[PDB]
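Incident log, entry 3
Record: peptide antibiotic AS-48 (70 residues)
Problem: checksum mismatch between cached and fresh output.
Input:
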Amino acid sequence: MAKEFGIPAAVAGTVLNVVEAGGWVTTIVSILTAVGSGGLSLLAAAGRESIKAYLKKEIKKKGKRAVIAW
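Fresh output:
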């Protein structure tokens, strides 16, 4: 999230913590839209898939730490 979307670690970690805690899609969308272009780009990358499901799958694929870095 950091290297490929320019989302800072503190925001990225917050978002992934919400994902892992089973938080609401609305919360994730609000944080990502508020961080600006990087968050908008990440939402775009998810396509039509729920941003929650998309990040869940990225965490499964790469591990949480690597998703933050990404």
